[PDB]
Structures are given as C-alpha cells and as structure tokens.
Amino acid sequence: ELSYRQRAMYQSLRNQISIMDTLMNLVMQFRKVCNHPDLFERADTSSPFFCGHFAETGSFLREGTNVALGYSTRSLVEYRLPRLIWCDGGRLDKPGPGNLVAGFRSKYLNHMMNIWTPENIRSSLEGIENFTWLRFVDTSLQEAYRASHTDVFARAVDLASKQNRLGHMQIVYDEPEDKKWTPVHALFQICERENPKAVAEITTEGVLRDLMNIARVKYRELGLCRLEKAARPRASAPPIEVVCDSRSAVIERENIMFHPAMRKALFGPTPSEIKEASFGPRPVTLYPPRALLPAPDHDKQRFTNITVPSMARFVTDSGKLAKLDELLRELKEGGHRVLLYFQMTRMIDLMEEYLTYRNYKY
Amino acid sequence: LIAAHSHIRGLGVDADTLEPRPSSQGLVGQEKARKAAAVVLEMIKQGKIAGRAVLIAGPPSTGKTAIAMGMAQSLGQDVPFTTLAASEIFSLEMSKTEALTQAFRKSIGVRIKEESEIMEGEVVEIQIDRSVTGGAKQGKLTIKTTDMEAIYDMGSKMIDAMTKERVMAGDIISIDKSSGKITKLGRSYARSRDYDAMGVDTKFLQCPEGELQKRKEVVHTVSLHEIDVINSRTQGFLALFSGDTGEIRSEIRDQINTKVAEWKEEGKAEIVPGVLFIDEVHMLDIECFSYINRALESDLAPIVIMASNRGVSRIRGTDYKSPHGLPLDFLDRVVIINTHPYTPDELRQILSIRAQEEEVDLTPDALALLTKIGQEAGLRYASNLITTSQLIAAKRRAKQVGVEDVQRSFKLFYDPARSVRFVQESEKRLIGNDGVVDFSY
Amino acid sequence: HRTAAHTHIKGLGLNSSGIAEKQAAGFVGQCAAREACGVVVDLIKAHKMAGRGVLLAGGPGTGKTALALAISQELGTKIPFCPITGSEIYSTEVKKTEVLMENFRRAIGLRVRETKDVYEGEVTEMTPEEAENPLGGYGKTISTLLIGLKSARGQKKLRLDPSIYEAIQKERVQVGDVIYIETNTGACKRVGRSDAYATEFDLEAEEYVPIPKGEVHKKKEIVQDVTLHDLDVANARPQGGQDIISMMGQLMKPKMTEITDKLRMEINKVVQKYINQGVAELIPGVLFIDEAHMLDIECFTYLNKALESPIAPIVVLASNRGIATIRGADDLKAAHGIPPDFLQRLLIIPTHPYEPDEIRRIVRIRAQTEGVQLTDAAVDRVAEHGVRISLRYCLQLLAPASILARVNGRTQVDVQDIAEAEELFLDARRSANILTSTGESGGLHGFIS
Amino acid sequence: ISEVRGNTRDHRTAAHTHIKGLGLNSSGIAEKQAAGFVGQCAAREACGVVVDLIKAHKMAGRGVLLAGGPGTGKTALALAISQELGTKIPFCPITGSEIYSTEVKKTEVLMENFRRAIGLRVRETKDVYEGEVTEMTPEEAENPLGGYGKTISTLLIGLKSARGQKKLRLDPSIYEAIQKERVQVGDVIYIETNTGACKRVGRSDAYATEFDLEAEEYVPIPKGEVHKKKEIVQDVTLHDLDVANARPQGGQDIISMMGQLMKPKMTEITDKLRMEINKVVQKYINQGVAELIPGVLFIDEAHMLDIECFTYLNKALESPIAPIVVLASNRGIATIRGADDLKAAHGIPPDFLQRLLIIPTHPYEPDEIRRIVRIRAQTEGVQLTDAAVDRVAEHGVRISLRYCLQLLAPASILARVNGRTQVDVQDIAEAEELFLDARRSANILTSTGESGGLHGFIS
Amino acid sequence: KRPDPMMIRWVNNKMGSVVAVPEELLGTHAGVVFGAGP
Numbered sequence A: 001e002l003s004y005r006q007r008a009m010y011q012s013l014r015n016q017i018s019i020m021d022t023l024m025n026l027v028m029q030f031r032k033v034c035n036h037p038d039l040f041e042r043a044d045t046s047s048p049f050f051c052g053h054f055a056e057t058g059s060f061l062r063e064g065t066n067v068a069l070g071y072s073t074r075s076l077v078e079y080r081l082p083r084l085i086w087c088d089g090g091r092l093d094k095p096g097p098g099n100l101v102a103g104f105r106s107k108y109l110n111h112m113m114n115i116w117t118p119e120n121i122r123s124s125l126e127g128i129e130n131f132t133w134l135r136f137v138d139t140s141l142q143e144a145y146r147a148s149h150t151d152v153f154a155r156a157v158d159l160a161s162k163q164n165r166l167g168h169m170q171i172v173y174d175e176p177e178d179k180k181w182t183p184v185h186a187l188f189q190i191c192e193r194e195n196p197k198a199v200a201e202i203t204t205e206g207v208l209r210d211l212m213n214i215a216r217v218k219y220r221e222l223g224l225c226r227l228e229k230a231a232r233p234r235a236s237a238p239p240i241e242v243v244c245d246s247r248s249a250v251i252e253r254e255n256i257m258f259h260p261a262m263r264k265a266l267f268g269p270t271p272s273e274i275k276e277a278s279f280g281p282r283p284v285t286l287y288p289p290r291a292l293l294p295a296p297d298h299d300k301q302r303f304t305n306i307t308v309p310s311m312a313r314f315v316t317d318s319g320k321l322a323k324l325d326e327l328l329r330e331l332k333e334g335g336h337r338v339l340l341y342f343q344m345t346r347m348i349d350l351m352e353e354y355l356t357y358r359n360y361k362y
Numbered sequence B: 001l002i003a004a005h006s007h008i009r010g011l012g013v014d015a016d017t018l019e020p021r022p023s024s025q026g027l028v029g030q031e032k033a034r035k036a037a038a039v040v041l042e043m044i045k046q047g048k049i050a051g052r053a054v055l056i057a058g059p060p061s062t063g064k065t066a067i068a069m070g071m072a073q074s075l076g077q078d079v080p081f082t083t084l085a086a087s088e089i090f091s092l093e094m095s096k097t098e099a100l101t102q103a104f105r106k107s108i109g110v111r112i113k114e115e116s117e118i119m120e121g122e123v124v125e126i127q128i129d130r131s132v133t134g135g136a137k138q139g140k141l142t143i144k145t146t147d148m149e150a151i152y153d154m155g156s157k158m159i160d161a162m163t164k165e166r167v168m169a170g171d172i173i174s175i176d177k178s179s180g181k182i183t184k185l186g187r188s189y190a191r192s193r194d195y196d197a198m199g200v201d202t203k204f205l206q207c208p209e210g211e212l213q214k215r216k217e218v219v220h221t222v223s224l225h226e227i228d229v230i231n232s233r234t235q236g237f238l239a240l241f242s243g244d245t246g247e248i249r250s251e252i253r254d255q256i257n258t259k260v261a262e263w264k265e266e267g268k269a270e271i272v273p274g275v276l277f278i279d280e281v282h283m284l285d286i287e288c289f290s291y292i293n294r295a296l297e298s299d300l301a302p303i304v305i306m307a308s309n310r311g312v313s314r315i316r317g318t319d320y321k322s323p324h325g326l327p328l329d330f331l332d333r334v335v336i337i338n339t340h341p342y343t344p345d346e347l348r349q350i351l352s353i354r355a356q357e358e359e360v361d362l363t364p365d366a367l368a369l370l371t372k373i374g375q376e377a378g379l380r381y382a383s384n385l386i387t388t389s390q391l392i393a394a395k396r397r398a399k400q401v402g403v404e405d406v407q408r409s410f411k412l413f414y415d416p417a418r419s420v421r422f423v424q425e426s427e428k429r430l431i432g433n434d435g436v437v438d439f440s441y
Numbered sequence C: 001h002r003t004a005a006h007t008h009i010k011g012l013g014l015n016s017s018g019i020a021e022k023q024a025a026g027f028v029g030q031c032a033a034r035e036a037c038g039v040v041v042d043l044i045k046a047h048k049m050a051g052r053g054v055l056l057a058g059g060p061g062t063g064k065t066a067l068a069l070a071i072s073q074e075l076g077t078k079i080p081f082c083p084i085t086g087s088e089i090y091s092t093e094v095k096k097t098e099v100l101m102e103n104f105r106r107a108i109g110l111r112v113r114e115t116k117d118v119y120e121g122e123v124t125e126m127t128p129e130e131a132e133n134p135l136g137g138y139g140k141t142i143s144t145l146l147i148g149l150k151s152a153r154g155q156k157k158l159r160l161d162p163s164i165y166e167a168i169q170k171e172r173v174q175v176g177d178v179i180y181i182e183t184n185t186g187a188c189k190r191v192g193r194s195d196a197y198a199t200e201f202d203l204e205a206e207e208y209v210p211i212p213k214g215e216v217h218k219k220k221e222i223v224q225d226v227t228l229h230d231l232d233v234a235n236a237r238p239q240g241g242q243d244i245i246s247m248m249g250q251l252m253k254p255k256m257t258e259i260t261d262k263l264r265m266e267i268n269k270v271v272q273k274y275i276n277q278g279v280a281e282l283i284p285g286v287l288f289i290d291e292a293h294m295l296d297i298e299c300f301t302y303l304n305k306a307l308e309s310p311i312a313p314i315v316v317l318a319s320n321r322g323i324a325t326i327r328g329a330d331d332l333k334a335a336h337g338i339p340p341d342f343l344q345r346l347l348i349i350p351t352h353p354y355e356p357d358e359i360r361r362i363v364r365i366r367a368q369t370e371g372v373q374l375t376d377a378a379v380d381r382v383a384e385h386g387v388r389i390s391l392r393y394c395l396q397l398l399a400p401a402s403i404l405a406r407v408n409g410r411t412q413v414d415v416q417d418i419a420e421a422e423e424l425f426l427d428a429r430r431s432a433n434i435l436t437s438t439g440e441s442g443g444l445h446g447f448i449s
Numbered sequence D: 001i002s003e004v005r006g007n008t009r010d011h012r013t014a015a016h017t018h019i020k021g022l023g024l025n026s027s028g029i030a031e032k033q034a035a036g037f038v039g040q041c042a043a044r045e046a047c048g049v050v051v052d053l054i055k056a057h058k059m060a061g062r063g064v065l066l067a068g069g070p071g072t073g074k075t076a077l078a079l080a081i082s083q084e085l086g087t088k089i090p091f092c093p094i095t096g097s098e099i100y101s102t103e104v105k106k107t108e109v110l111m112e113n114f115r116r117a118i119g120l121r122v123r124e125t126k127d128v129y130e131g132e133v134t135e136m137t138p139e140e141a142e143n144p145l146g147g148y149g150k151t152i153s154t155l156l157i158g159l160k161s162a163r164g165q166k167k168l169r170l171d172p173s174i175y176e177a178i179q180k181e182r183v184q185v186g187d188v189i190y191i192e193t194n195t196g197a198c199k200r201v202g203r204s205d206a207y208a209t210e211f212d213l214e215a216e217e218y219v220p221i222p223k224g225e226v227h228k229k230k231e232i233v234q235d236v237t238l239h240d241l242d243v244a245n246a247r248p249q250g251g252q253d254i255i256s257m258m259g260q261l262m263k264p265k266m267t268e269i270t271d272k273l274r275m276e277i278n279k280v281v282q283k284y285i286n287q288g289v290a291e292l293i294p295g296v297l298f299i300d301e302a303h304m305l306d307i308e309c310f311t312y313l314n315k316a317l318e319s320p321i322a323p324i325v326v327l328a329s330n331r332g333i334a335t336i337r338g339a340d341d342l343k344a345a346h347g348i349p350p351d352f353l354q355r356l357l358i359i360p361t362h363p364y365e366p367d368e369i370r371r372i373v374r375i376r377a378q379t380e381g382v383q384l385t386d387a388a389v390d391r392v393a394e395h396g397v398r399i400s401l402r403y404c405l406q407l408l409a410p411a412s413i414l415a416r417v418n419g420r421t422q423v424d425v426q427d428i429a430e431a432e433e434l435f436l437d438a439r440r441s442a443n444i445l446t447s448t449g450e451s452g453g454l455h456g457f458i459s
Numbered sequence E: 001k002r003p004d005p006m007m008i009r010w011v012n013n014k015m016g017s018v019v020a021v022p023e024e025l026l027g028t029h030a031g032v033v034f035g036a037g038p
Ligand SMILES: Nc1ncnc2c1ncn2[C@@H]1O[C@H](COP(=O)(O)OP(=O)(O)O)[C@@H](O)[C@H]1O
Pocket: B004, B005, B006, B008, B026, B027, B028, B029, B030, B059, B060, B061, B062, B063, B064, B065, B066, B067, B350, B353, B379, B380
C-alpha cells in the first residue's frame, strides 16, 4: 500500500473531493503522489521553526560572487529600556557619574575589606585562625584569592592547565620505604593522593578500568550515539535582547552575549598562535591550551537540530519504490539491468537519483 | 549467590495446554494462579493487546512474587520486564506521575536493526602525523589478509583509538567502521625485542582470510524511555544511567510515539511490548492510581502486573479503606488472581527445593520437623532455618543436617509469633508506644 | 495495530443534522451525550470562542473518556487535542499553575509559513583571518573566515562573521565537505564529503553526497506547525543563536521554568504580527482534563482567570464522583468534586449507565474489534456480566477466553472458555469476598490490614 | 617541615572499646564471660552463627533482627560481629535516621548503603618503569625518511631509582609524551607499559639547590626498584562502581570541569546501571579475576525506618547480589512510622518481620552488671575498691547499666583531685550527687513544674 | 612533495619504528628532544 508519507498527503488532497467538484486536476495529483511523494513535495534538509528576525537576501542577481555574511539573528521579543536605566546608573554595579556608590563599593568590598586578599589572608594564617588550613591545601594565597574572585567558568579554564601530580605519586611512592610520601603542602588532599582511579588506569588487566566505564561503553554499544533523532524542538529562538539607543549598550552586548574569552576557551587556540608556539625557540603555554568545548553525545547530530533527508527514507517514502526495490534486486539476480517506463517524466529524474544512490545501472 | 527466588526457573506449565504441573521448574501448587499467570504470559508474548492490569492477590508468602519471577524467567531476556517497587515512585527529582510514565516507557522495547560493516586484518604498517602543540592528526593504516592489502586513511578519532589500543604492525585487529571501535584480536608476528616497555604479547593468530570488509547485520533493543532521554537533550546522555533526567516534556514523547510508529511502518524497528511488574502496589497514592488507570488506555501501554498483601485497607493519601487498599474504580480495570496458602505437602516440596538449591542434605526427620515448623512458624522462617542448621551442623562436622541441628536452630532463632510473645512478655522493658520504659532490674 | 480500550471508537457517529445514530462509529447509546459532544466539536471548529468549559459528568465506566477521544477524532489531526489527567499537574520543577498554563498554550496551535534563506555547496576554500588583540589575556582572535562554496550552478566566496565560523568549527567542517549554512540562525550542518574523491579506503565511514544541484544560494519556503507553548519554550530557553548564551544553553541540563506572563503576552504580539503578515493561521484547539476531580482548589481558582484570558482553548473536564470533598479544601464538599464557583462556568454533559442490550452490543463490537470470533451463547454469557458486574469486566474477559479457546484447539470461543476465564480471573467483588472471609480473623495466613 | 611529635600512641576509650569479639568456643558455645562480654550467651551464640553465615558465600539477602530493650547490648553485638569479620569484609553501619536525605529519595540513600555493604576484590598487575631521568638521547635511524633530514629509530632514557638504574630503550613515539609533559634530565617520571607513554611526578630533589629560586616543589627519587611488576589488590565496593560510572571524574571538557568545581550532588542511580554493573561483575567473577565479598549492612534504630523503606527492602533483599542486613530495634509494639493506622511488634511491619531471623536480647542479672563494671573500669583505666564496685553495681540494679558506667570517669577525676590513685565509696557517693540520673531529675521536674511560675520549668 | 613544516611523522612496520622530523622544526624547541634544538 501507500507509505505513510504518501497516505497522509493523498488523504488530505483526496479529501478535497468532498469540498470541490477539478476532478481531473485532483486525480492527476493522485497519480503523482501514488508514484512518489517527492514528485509532489521534495524532501529536503530542514530545521525547527525559527522564532527570530534575520536579514533576507532581496536579490540573487545583484548579490555577486563575494558576499559578507553578518550574524543577523536577533530576537523578535525585544525589551526596550531607557539609557537612564541601562547605561546612566540604573545598573547599581556600573560605576560612572550618578552611580557614585559603585566605584567605592567595588574597591572596598572586593579588595580592601575582602578576606581573600593576600594581605588579609596572611594575617590569619596560623594557629586557630580561619586560614590555618591554607598551608596544607595546595593553593597559594594567590590561587585562593583568584579562586574566590573568578567565576566557575574562569576557574574551570584554569583547571584545564593543571597536572594531576598527586595521582602520579600514587603510582610511584607505593612502598613502605616511600611511606606513601606526599608533599606536606598537599597533606589535606587525602582523596587525591589515595584514589583507585589512578591505579586502575596503569594496571595491564583493565578489569577495574572497564568496571568504571560500563555506562559509557554500553550507551555507545546500544548505538544510541548513532540512531536517528526521534524528536527535536518544534520552535527555536535566539536570546531575548535589551534594545537601548546608545553605543555603550551595543558594546556591552558584544562583551557579554558574544564574550570573547569564553568563546576562545571553548574553541581553543587560534591558528597563528599554534604556528608561533610550534616554531618558537622555547616552549610556550598556549591559552586555553585546548578546545574546552565537549564532544557532542550524538556523534552525528552534534550541536544543531538540522536534519538531512536519508536516501533510505526516500526509498521507503514510496510504497511502489519500496516494493520495486525488492523486485529490482530480484531482477538483478535474475540478470536484468534496470529498464522501466514512466507516465511522469520527472519520475525518471528521481530514479536516476535512486540509481546513482544504489549504483545499479540502466 | 543464592537468593530468595533463585530456585524459580519458570512457571511450570505445559506449553501446549497451559496445564500447571503440580511441581516443576521450581514452582509448587498455586495451580489455579499459575494457569491464570500462564494465560497472561501468553497474551504478553502475543503482543496484540495493550494495557491489561492483572493483580496477583493473597496473604503474605504464597508465592505471588515467586509467580511473577517465574513469568520473568519464562519470557527470557528479550522481552522487557521492569520490576518496580511502588516506593520507588516517590522521587525528589521528579513527580510521581513522571516516575510512573518513565516506568511504563521502560517496559516497551524498540528492537532496531542495522547493517554494520567490519574489518578483519593484519596491520602491516602504521603512519601517524601529529601537529606539534596539538590539534590536527593524520595517518594511514596498511592492513592485510591472506588475500588483500589496502591503505586506509585515518582521522583523529581513529588515531586516538589506535594509540589508546596501542596498535602496532603484526597485530590482528578488527574495526567496526560504523561505531569506530577497535579491538586487538592477537598477533601474527612475535613480539619484537628492539624496544622495552612494549607490554603484554597477546594471543598468537594466523592472518585473517578473505576480504577485508564484511557487512554485519546487528540488532539492538532500546526502551521508549531510552529514546525519550536522548531526544529531550542535546548533551548529557549519561542520564540514561545516572538518572539525572528531569520531568521530560510531553512534546518530546508525542514526537517519539509518532516516529516509532513510522519506524515500524518503515520496517526499521519492531516494537516489543513487555511487562511492568509493580510489587507492593498498595503503596501507591490515589494520585498514582488515577494516573495508571488512564495511562493503561494508550496503545503503547505495557501489560501491568501487581501484587498486594493487603486486606480491606486504607488507601494512601485519603481517609477511607478499600479491598487490597486499591481504589474501586482502579480495581474495576483489574482482573484479580488469588494465591492460596500452602498445604503441608506443598510446604514439604518447597522446602525440599530450597534445601536442594542451597545444596543442604536434610535428613528425612529434619525435613519432617522443618515441615512441622513450616506449618506453625511459616515458610520463610522454615526456609531460614535450613541454611542456619547447615552452619550449626558444620560446627559439629555433621555430614547431614540432623534433627538436633534444626532444634538447635529453632532454639537460637525466634519465629515472628514467638517474637511477638517475647515482646508481650517484656512490655515493661521495651520502649512502648507511649515512649515510657523501665531500665531497672 | 495493538488493541486498546478505545480502538473501536472512530467518531461520534452523528448525522449531518447532528442527531446521533443509535449505533454508529463504534458507539452504542449515550446519544444525548454524543449529540452534546457534537455541538462542542462545532464550538471548536468555529474558531470564534475562547475559554468555554465542558464537563463530562457520569459514573465510572460510562464512556466519558470514549466521548473525549471521539471528539479528538472528529476534530482530526489539524486541530490540537491536548489530553491530561488532573494528576499530571503536580510538578516538582515548577508550580502547578505553570503546568496548567503550559497545557493551555499547548492546546493552541499555529500553522506558519517560513522562508529558510540558506547557502549550500562543496567547501572548496577555507581561509581564516585574525587580529592580534590588545592584552585581554585570551590572545589572538579570528576576525573572519573566507570560505568558498561550489554548487552545480557555479560558486561563491563567503566572508563569514566569526560567530558563524564557530558554527563551522563546532560542525568540524573541512575543505572538500558539502555543507548547509542557514542564514536565519547562523547554524551549520555538514552534509557529507563530496562524491568527488569518494574512494573506499577511509576508516572514517564518511557519507559521500552529490554536489548540491541548483544555485549555491537558495531561499526555500516551508510550512511549520507549532503551538504557542513551543514559542514560549524556545524564547525562555534560547538555543537557536550562535552566541555564548545559546551555546552554553545547549550544554546545561534541560529544566522547566515558570515562564512569565510578560513573555507570554509579548509572544502574542509576535504571533499577531505573523497573522497580519499573512504567514500564519491561528488554529485554537481543546484541552481535555481527565480525572478533573484530582485537581485542587488552587488549580480550579487559577482556571477562573486562565479561562477569562482573551485567548484560551476549550477545556473539557471529566469527573466520576458524587458529592465529594474538594481536594485542598477539606471544609468544602460539592457535586462532581468541582468547586461551586467553577461549576457555574461549565456546560455539563451528564452521561448515563448502559442497558443490558447495549452491553450485549458493546461486547459484540469489542469482540470483533479484538478479532475474538465469539458464539451467540458466549456473547449472552459475557453480557450477563456487565449487568451483574462492571462492563469493563466483560471486555477484559474476551482476551483470556480467546487464549483458553485456542489452547483448547477451538477456532472460536464457547461458553466453556468464558466459564474458565470467569474462574481464573476474578472481578473486584468476588476478590473482596475472599478478603473478608479469609481475613475474617488475623493470623499467619491472614490478609494484612 | 612538620615537627613530628614523639609522645605515646595511646587511644581514646568509647562505650564499646571493651568489646573485642563474641567470645565463643570453637564449638560455637558462648563462654560465660569472654572478649569483653558478660552473659547474653544465647544472643552471642546466635550472632556466632550469623558470623559464619556471612563468612560463607552462600548467603544473599538474609535479614536479622536484634530485638530487646534499651541497654541490652544489641549495638555491642553488632560491633562484635563486625570485629569477628574484621576489616576485609565490609561492615556498613547506619541509623534509620540517616535515610531521610534532602538530596535524593530515601530509597536511593538506602540502596547506596545496601551496595556500600557489598565489596569487590580485584587483583591486577601494576607494571611500570620509574626513576629520575638520568639521560635522554636519540638513536639516529639507519634509513632516514626522505625530506625530513632527522629520523630517530630509538630514544634511550636512563632512569635511576634508590635501588639502581637502568638503560631503557623506548619506541620513539614517546617523544610526544616527553614534549607535552616537558620531561627533562633530573625529573622523576614513570613509564607505563600498557601505553608506552610517560608521566612526570616532578623534579628530583637532588636538584633542589640548582637555583636560589625555582617555581616548583621537588620530589624524592623513587625508593623502589627502577622496574616495578607487582600484583595489586584493590578494595572496591559496588557503590564505588555506581558513582564512578554515574559521575565520571577525569573529564577534560568545560562541563566536566565546571561539574567537579561544584558540589557532587547525589543522583537517583538507575536500576539499569546497577543491573548492568552486576552483569559485568558476575562476568569477571566467572573469569576468576575478582572475588565478591558481601558484607553487613547494619541498621540501628531500624524502627526509625518507615513503611516505604521496608517495602523497598523487600525488593532489595530479593536481589541476587546483596549483603546481609542486620536490624536492631527496641520499640515494643509501636506505630509504624509511615502507616499511622498500623501497630506492630518491634515497629517492624508484619509483612517484613516474617523475613527476619529474630535474635532476642534479655536484661542483666545483678551479678552480670557487677562483672560489666569490672570490665569497664579496667578499660577506662579506673581502679576501684570492691565497695566502690558494689556501690556502682547497686546503682546498675536500681537505675541503669549505662548510668553506672558513666559514673566511673567523674569519680576517677574526683579521686585523683583528692590525691587518691584509686576510687573509693567517698568518690562514688560524690559522683552520684553531681551527676543525676534521668529519674531523680524527672522528680525535680515533677515537683518544680507542677505549675507555671517565675522559677517554673516550661511544659 | 616536500613534507609539512609541522607534522612530525611516526611510522611502524616489521623493521620497528622511526620518527622523522621536518627540517622546519630542527632549531625549534620541538627539535630539542631529537638533539636538534636552537
Ligand atoms: N509455589 C512456590 N514454589 C517455590 N517457592 C515458593 C513458592 N511460593 C513461595 N515460595 C518461596 O517462599 C518465599 C516466599 O514467597 P514470596 O513469593 O516471597 O511470597 P510473597 O507473595 O509474600 O512475595 C520465597 O523465597 C519464594 O521463593
């Protein structure tokens, strides 16, 4: 019978028999969809509905061969704010004229009267004082200060540079003679100095190594990383934006919503930086130093909701083509090359696309 | 290990007539209930009918779980059998309704087939090029059968796998081209001697024969719940396992239901509907029952089996009682199975199976006494005394459990009824419901 | 294909005049209720009305849910039918009135024409260009990418915004790939390798795809079906941009959020632009709140305001309960379990028990729906239940009796196979007798209270 | 760096420090007093069979109830069971109160502890080369590749340990690890043979004087052999496998690294994960490369569990991999925590109680209390006149065992404060007057809080 | 074809393995491991 794609469109258009008459026009498109639905509406690469503004190309002929693609994507939801609020001191943290508090308050609350500044920490570093432990946590006063002022993203970028040296000590300082040695300034990192995760990676029988990767292995072995997506969001939108008639807003939009340091951290070192680092006379530590964007869990859909039509979908979208595929394979084994005749000339083009997919010959 | 039901290996019915044998496959008695469960089991296998709720009812023991475990064994691994304790539904990460929705959708399999393609050959050479300071990697693999040699280009993902596997010339390897996984099968050359730290010399193998590429049809079964989790997300598919998944939106499920139907019409997938077994079902709230009753009505609903020990008992989350503790408009949708307490010869046969499963050689008089204990103390207690008497017998090096060991076990360990009397005989010294107690002599 | 409680229901079975045929489209009886449900279908198909309430009132097993699913089939696929139970409203992520609003806006659909403005080609050149920033500490930044795209109708060179190069980079595009670029979102898709240089000897399992036919720049148009709730969720959790918020918003765990009235109001303005632009048809649908007695007095008091909204779906409630205590309001009893304030808003369709010959008819409709070929004496037997026992108990026996008959080698179910089904599979009342007789006293073999 | 303290390694004494075991013959019969116990000969013999039940790997999912009044030694018996098993078998004690987490459903908290009580013992061989890098030196290849000009066929590295040094010939691919890891002569590294890569521990402290300032700490030369090949035995619980799979630790992406910078919130580990973990574990057991070592989940004040916890335990105990559960309860006939209409013995639902082996614990005779006072005194280090012993034991009969044991330390203070190296009646008669029991204090309450008033207790 | 300036090449076969280094990397820090630093 008809494939569900055919059956849906055929039913919707044959329902017009109840509405009108035009019968010849209708039964012509009956014959169309009953041959292949891609004659009636071609399956083509598609994505969710975009609930946003973009700049349309008004002409192709005027466009030329070199064109600049700006990022035009903006929200249709659009939050108009006066510059009195958004720029001239209605943001309490933004110092300037009018907002006379923010400049004082930033210095005193974040530095002068801030307990994590090294001068304050250094006064609290002995005995029963609140930073007594900082000798045995592996951070310096500088790293503690940094970690208390930078956000979780910036701190996570800093983690990307570090070496898990306490895990290597677990491999080397094993024996009674080694006394399970640990550097005394890392004394309190007990669970880093003693952790099966390090040992399981060095033993040649990977038994506990595999027991710790069970979930990620079977997820992959189930093919869930490769199976087609069964759903996606029906609508998609870019972030809502403030709209303010000032230049400071446009700069601050670019500084936050297109934040260069976050983007550089995610996407890694720039190609000239890689060249400079590899041709230099002495080694240099790049930033970040690698792309910190994760691997996508779906190994084929990656980071976008765009679908590309499969040729297997095209084959099964026509019941005749699905049935013919078995008959043509039988006829191939029967020794016949493909030879067919069509009432609609455009169906010959789809069969050429079908045959150039299958690589069977006319 | 040996667990409470490890002797149950099926339902013990004639596959032709569904007649229950009086004892087989480790089940004993309950013949009316075992035949009923066998009719349910067949309409599970047939798949045709969705959304049947069958309640197994009875006093404590009498094998209601044992029957449900016999059904699970008879379905085998392929059909989903989601065991759920009704107290699992009260999550803090999701509502009871969402927790039930996930439990239903865990019980419907999608059985998806694909043609993989695989390689099998000796590695003759490897070349890898690496960008200093990281980034790009490139390489070529030269791989061999008795009948072919070919040079395959390698991407970074494959070079990571090759180096993680520490692939070397003279290795026999297989590559699943679709997934990209590599496995070393062995080596055809000796392990070299020019280098140290080369590590373990794997199995010797002759070189693979035939063509390098072979197609391979493989089949994977995934739940509707596993399709839900990975289609509600871009990233974080470990939520299949960690359980981090939130309350999944219904738009995603509506889409998946439509697509799985389409995959069935395409012949890409077979839907394999299985069982959700809700043990202790009386523990659900009125809000849970008023969800299941309409969740059952969907075409993708599994067959739901339940067990309850409860009499005419209070429904949780409301002010009133009902049979089984289950709402009447819920029980309206249920066909009920009743299990019956065992006779002494049924007790004797069960205890013999428990003894054989634990590999304990009871003397005949010990089995008689355990049967007498079974009648008065209960089947579980009489079961617990079998392993206990085996240990006591081992203290005295006895080659069989004698009556003395069962009596010694009966002496050391109290049954419930005797413990209730012990409590009543010490109401002054135990903490009362008033919280009062006397600590003095 | 699988057979379920309502597979026999195909529609309301009305005449063109809107009178019910006494047995049609799978129904038997309920004619006055099927006629009232027809006038509700007319109220829905005529888009003019918002926020009307219907209550299907009637005891359990009187086909209230069959009526609601029949409405869902008379409306067809185009109109949104949004079924929920009252027990779905208690989310752990967001307040229960959020879930109601989400379901109200999920029950309003939109069909909208969309132009996708895209570039397609084989990547023939890709050349990044960059600036040495002042000392921000993150180092050099790519200022732009120059990329060459080749299609069948020649080629074009694109100087991309670096925001779009990040899409190209996270898509792992290379020279010689075929890519799709969507200028709506700045989003990218790697379609494959070219069919050029499509040699077999890659471990990479590449999909080689033909060069895009046609012009390298295209402006295809497609019609999208969306709900208002789909727009709310898109704009509350933005994910379609190439900005950092959209990027990280795909890495974070998805979670529901208490979408504000402010957002919903401003999406009404956006959708009304699509209407005035002529690119969208508004298609309001229906919300079926089954088991509406499981709502609570905060849900019902919210529904007052929600139905007064200048756009709201039709709401169909169903309840099976007499004079009952309102949940969350143990001081207040009312009929149907619905507050007396809210019941005034509804049109009540009362629903009635079936007669014995209707049960016989339903049993025969249901038997042939399941493919249970059933003798007339066997039909009469099953229809003695439904009178003496619930109707549902009749229909549930048909499958066991079929199994037992076929195990007995019969082609068709006799009275014997039902009489065995009646014995293996008890009704609630016979089981309730077993409880009261066996649990007549406590003990080792008693039922637990 | 740290200034080590030379003082004696004594130990603190707690309420159970005197208990050392169950005190049983090889026939399993209890000795009338032994290993710190006095009496409870029945309950000690029963616990001795439970001990042999646990040490025999047939057990799965059995339940025990220690039933008896407060003060009757049920927690002492559980600790004695734990000591009889020793450290190689997991003993996981919790109260029922610990199950009411805010952070996951309580059936998850109980299943975590249920799996904590199950151990796995994995044997593997560690195989490394380690040392200070004495040298790095390329071997130029016989047949260089055209257009490169440099071609190395071997890299040679010298590694010194405290116990010797070796000339090590390595596949040149190690250049990648050395260049990334920035290995230098005088750095301490190891080579692992399952990868051929290397990792840097640090610079050898032989070079700590190379500069007045350098920005790294130095590490000692490895004190083992230059080449290690050792079997290693890893203590693992199945709960460790749960967490290690459900929250991988080493991930190098931003979301992993942001994850490890934020609190490691518990998650409702799926049964699908746990059931696959079990299957791979059972595979490796059948290979014989691992031992399962099921241990004891001990739940004290188990009457604090509710009926939802107990109904889940039904399913949990039916698992084919499960610890033994030992419950302790003192709640008479009492209302079930989560089923206010239902009373049952021990506060355990009758459904669940039928599963447990109940062990009763009885009160103590006046002469047993006296023997306990003797055992406790010598454990605290207190020494008593016999008239002080008899006075303490008399309070044990009239008031409570626990109260009398708590008088020993106060009276020892007062004795030495009065210059006496042993406690006498004059000190006991004073300890008992500074430190009241609950009854004498309840009498003060009953007399003083007869009404509201300016000096009244608040009722 | 002259080799890439910055791809160092490892190749392994029956004869064991070698690493070959681009002439552009000799005299860089990446040459130091090979005896061919600045
Ligand atoms: N018919 C039977 N055949 C074999 N074992 C049984 C049978 N009935 C009960 N048992 C065993 O006795 C114990 C109690 O039965 P169970 O199924 O747990 O009862 P409940 O209905 O309370 O779950 C279990 O160990 C079970 O395996």
